[PDB]
Design a protein around this ligand. Structure first.
Ligand SMILES: *[C@@H]1O[C@H](CO)[C@@H](O[C@@H]2O[C@H](CO)[C@@H](O[C@@H]3O[C@H](CO)[C@@H](O)[C@H](O)[C@@H]3O)[C@H](O)[C@H]2NC(C)=O)[C@H](O)[C@H]1NC(C)=O
Ligand SMILES: *[C@@H]1O[C@H](CO)[C@@H](O)[C@H](O)[C@H]1NC(C)=O
Ligand SMILES: [Ca+2]
Ligand SMILES: [Ca+2]
Ligand SMILES: [Ca+2]
Lengths: 193, 218, 215
């Protein structure tokens, strides 16, 4: 029928990163941020931090539906991420402009009934080093839902409790252990396996 | 056919499950499409943003015709246009919100119960309801029932030219206690009250990093 | 749709804010482009934008051909698109430049056309009309586009490599707007976002934009 993914869009000749609408297997439309530039492109970005203008210390309902701005920082929403999911790439930039990434061969979040349980594939490569497998098979947790954190390190993650905290505070935190240091830029993105 | 099925406000859009802030098209009461910036994130969301300053990349020291039609960029700073702002507030009760950020990352705000600008014939007269609350303090009530003025069309209550003296465009009285369309002066300035100023907020000598004005139906 | 064919059409239809809109190319191919509705009367289609150095412009032929970058920031629209945009009739060109002290310079030319890929996206430029940046494009008239992997210049070496850009290089250049984002004055010779008649071979601008409008 029409574009299912950012990869479809890239194959149809959309070469600039930006917000495009795609159709989920639901057939429900959704405008997403396509990264057409990184690692071959065709990535759908579901998380972005870039300047600390958006509060990421949010409750369950807010993470469920998504929040933020197409103009800047956002979380796409756990329902959308579930519908969406296919491999994972996390991109990270520090304040010295150093680039660091990690790539997982598969990435899926379950539905709300399974509390958006993270089921993550094998680490593939990445100067950032593996820091999410250790959170595999864990529900998602927000300040208004325990799960052995969210309040301790101020954020929301598949928390006993973490080795990455990308929805943490913009401290200039947004931590990746293998990578006390909060990154300038963080992006989480997906692409058909 | 799209007018009758399309959304009429950002609140409608939020109601249809649009949770990310961004530019969407809505249909004015006369059925004309208008691409607006929806703030879905702040104070429950569903706000239509008609003003935004963020980096000083756009000149806001503009004439009447330019303020009338709107100017700026969807990528950054803009004024939606006085005709559009009138169309959006002409019928019913839109509350107004003002969000301000300083260069030390202090977020401040002001909220009013209703906000309407009249049409061009009435020179976009401001009809402002009650100040509800806001950490930024009230700096708009002073401007109720004032015409809008630009450097080239002085409709203020000052014997001189407010828009020229304070280098902006606004519902100036004699002259102002707020000046959000003022120069992008970046924090403190020696020049007097000619920046993005909110008197009850950071005063007449400090120009905000971020300014946003937005409406939502009551 | 038979609708808007240019950013100027959009402006006439009452689109007053700069931003990305879709237009219909001469062949009815739809294209989403950045419209500058603010500058010099507005109605400009922007095909090049530098603003913060977040995008690598040191790219190969295929990449310049199809376009690259981001609607959120820096981009090159793509040589095929630029050709499609400028084949029929008269597009005038405006080049807008902003230094790190926020001073604006510009250059305006009466006509601007790039040929198709067979003709190596040749520069066909009209008379300089005015501009505070001076004229650093006319030197480049009637010259094939070159990238690091496709050397069509008049130098015995590879201009694109020597000045880390992609341009209508001769021997080698007087402007280099797709050069490295070097942030102001730089010791290194002429490998930044340079406009000789502007801030010279040793100053790289903060902002650069190249745009077209029906004359
Ligand atoms: C907005 O401001 C306009 C000025 O442009 C106000 O118009 C003025 O309204 C006052 C009411 O407070 C009128 O004063 C009254 O004058 C009559 C004589 O006509 C007198 O009997 C009363 O004792 C009282 O002083 C005044 O005429 C009028 N002036 C003009 C030039 O129209 C208007 O009231 C304001 N509107 C709102 C909603 O505040
Ligand atoms: C352009 O240059 C080509 C060779 O590169 C030459 O054949 C032709 O005469 C030139 N045309 C014009 C109009 O300058
Ligand atoms: Ca006056
Ligand atoms: Ca080659
Ligand atoms: Ca050569």
């Amino acid at each position: 029928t029409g574009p299912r993914t950012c990869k479809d869009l890239l194959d149809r000749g959309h070469f600039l990163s930006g917000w495009h609408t795609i159709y989920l297997p639901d057939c429900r439309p959704l405008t997403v941020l396509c990264d057409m530039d990184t690692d071959g492109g065709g990535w759908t970005v579901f998380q972005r931090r870039v300047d600390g203008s958006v509060d990421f210390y949010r409750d369950w309902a807010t993470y469920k539906q998504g929040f933020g701005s197409r103009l800047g920082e956002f979380w796409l929403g756990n329902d959308n991420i579930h519908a969406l999911t296919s491999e994972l790439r996390t991109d990270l930039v520090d304040f010295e402009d150093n680039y660091q990434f990690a790539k997982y061969r598969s990435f899926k979040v379950a539905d709300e009934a399974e509390k958006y349980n993270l089921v993550l594939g094998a680490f593939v490569e990445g100067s950032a080093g593996d820091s999410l497998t250790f959170h595999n098979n864990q529900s998602f947790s927000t300040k208004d839902q325990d799960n052995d954190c969210a309040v301790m390190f101020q954020g929301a993650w598949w928390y006993n409790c973490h080795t990455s905290n990308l929805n943490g505070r913009y401290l200039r935190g947004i931590n990746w252990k293998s990578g006390n240091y909060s990154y300038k830029v963080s992006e989480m993105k997906v692409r058909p396996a």
